[PDB]
Amino acid sequence: GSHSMRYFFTSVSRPGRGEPRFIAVGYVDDTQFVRFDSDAASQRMEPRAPWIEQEGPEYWDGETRKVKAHSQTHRVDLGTLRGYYNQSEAGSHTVQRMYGCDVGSDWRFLRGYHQYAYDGKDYIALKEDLRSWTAADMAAQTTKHKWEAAHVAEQLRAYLEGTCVEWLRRYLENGKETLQRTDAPKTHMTHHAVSDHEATLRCWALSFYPAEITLTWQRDGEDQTQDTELVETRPAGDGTFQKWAAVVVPSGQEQRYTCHVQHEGLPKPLTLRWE
Amino acid sequence: GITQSPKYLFRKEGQNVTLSCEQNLNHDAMYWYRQDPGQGLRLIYYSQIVNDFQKGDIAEGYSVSREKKESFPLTVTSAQKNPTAFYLCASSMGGTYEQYFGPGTRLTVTEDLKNVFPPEVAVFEPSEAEISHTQKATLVCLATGFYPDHVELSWWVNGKEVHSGVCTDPQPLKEQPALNDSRYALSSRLRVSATFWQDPRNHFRCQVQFYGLSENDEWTQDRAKPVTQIVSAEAWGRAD
Amino acid sequence: QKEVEQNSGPLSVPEGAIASLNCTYSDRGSQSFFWYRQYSGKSPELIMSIYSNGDKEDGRFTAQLNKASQYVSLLIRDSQPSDSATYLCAVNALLGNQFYFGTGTSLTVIPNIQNPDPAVYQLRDSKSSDKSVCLFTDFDSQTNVSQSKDSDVYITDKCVLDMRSMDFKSNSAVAWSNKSDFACANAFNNSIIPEDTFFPS
């Protein structure tokens, strides 16, 4: 929707040379603001955005207590899961959990999700009604019935319908100059001679936030999907993102090929040409 | 599946105590509270991982050690200014999840063991003026001059414990409330029918269990030793 | 203040009526709300748990939760003598990963007794025969007793005994002293006597 808060947790096992490594990150929109790493030296929930740093020590002491227990929960999850499929103790596995809520323009609850993955594929997820479950395999329904008898979906719905949006609004207002901003793309176009008859036109879009963007190629006002190379959005590290789309063009008729950049900070889409 | 031991404990001022708490629910978190009369609960120590315990609001004079997930032994020390309280052990799955309590341990620390006395139990037959005007009759029992207030009273009619027509004071009163080490007094009443009391074959007894010292504790006084004992008083029916 | 507040003052509700125990809290990312029942001398027993706004019914009591205004309540129907206890309010805290308890509200259901016969009798010892106690009994619910202003006289509070043989309950208190000169018409003077009492010879 308009805004969203998300968390990501990963626990990779290291059989024979240590306990499973736990990494937790938190994002609002496309901005990371918290992180944790069992291999890091701080051993605490660290800030990654300027606005989150103003929180009190009870906030950081609490978030540190959660990841220290969440890591322990994933440890018994890895040991239990290797028995669900009867896997050896030498194979290295990983666990991924994520959840979050999406809000609308009124900053009220619009959508919630909570998903769990084992070894890179889906395990079990909360449906869009936040009341049912979607188990992947036979062993996935073993934990579903274990979580249905414990009324897990009831207390998970509360995070997504309740404190997620109430603490997402708290983050949207405190960090207003960071999260509620919108940076229009800085666009330009390069020209590269491939052969005597063909040349590639590359349409650049830099320094834009959020990451959602659409790059379309048109010829005489008609979309052209053939002979087009589009690359996925790249994080610049400046807190902004980068993306470009190219097209190979017969030499001499680049006047007809038009690039089109659609973004949140652009009411009407931009149109890029070579000359 | 949460248990504590013992239900009633009594020690002398200056030594250490070890209140045990075992947990069968395989909960990750365990909690220790103290409950003073009429002042609610207060957190002493709590843990969320196997070896991660954290200090509560009032940790002065308290020590704890969670070496394994099953037990949460809280040891109180002489540094505690007022150790006498109702210690409650709880455990739960997560720090933010609902907790479940064990039976609780009442610890009572006194200056010296001289203030410990078993209760003096006596029964008081009904009055004939009540029997005529009400067609009923109460038997009032009194356990007086005991300390600490570790007393559980029960009535026994014809050798069997009864609960109907029984009323016991919720908590005993200090015989001299101005003193800190005051003795306690408890009262109870068993009202039966007038035609029931006049039957001479009916047996009435007021039983008062007292939880004082254990026989392995040292007692230097020449008075009778206030061990955990039973004190009662009997009464029979009277057609007069 | 505390993270969870509730009126600790002893609340009274007639038997069969509806008891309304209220509880307010300070928002610490609070998400789960519970009600514990604790009888005198025993452990708090978990009796209720609610997680969303609205009413949740279970047994003779309902849990009502509002999160816009920080407060959670507990309504109890058909107030029975077994409901007389202090009810503790529990509110979790995602800020800090903590769990907070209120001070507790002492609930005492009062019996609706009719056709009372207030009187003060004297009960002598079954065996000693030289000790004496006084019994203020069969007085109505409006009457209250107070502590004695003398260190030699001991007074107990009210007490509701239930004779299940018949269909009536009766309030009763006891007063005794070691004065060896005391007459039962002297202790209960501190309390408000309903004037309907009968003092035997």
């Binding site: 906030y59 227990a69 999850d77 899961l81 | 799955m93 933010t96 | 789960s32």
Partner: peptide, 9 residues
């Protein structure tokens, strides 16, 4: 803020 401590599978 993060969610409650999760349930073990």
């Amino acid at each position: 803020i993060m969610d409650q401590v999760p349930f073990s599978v």
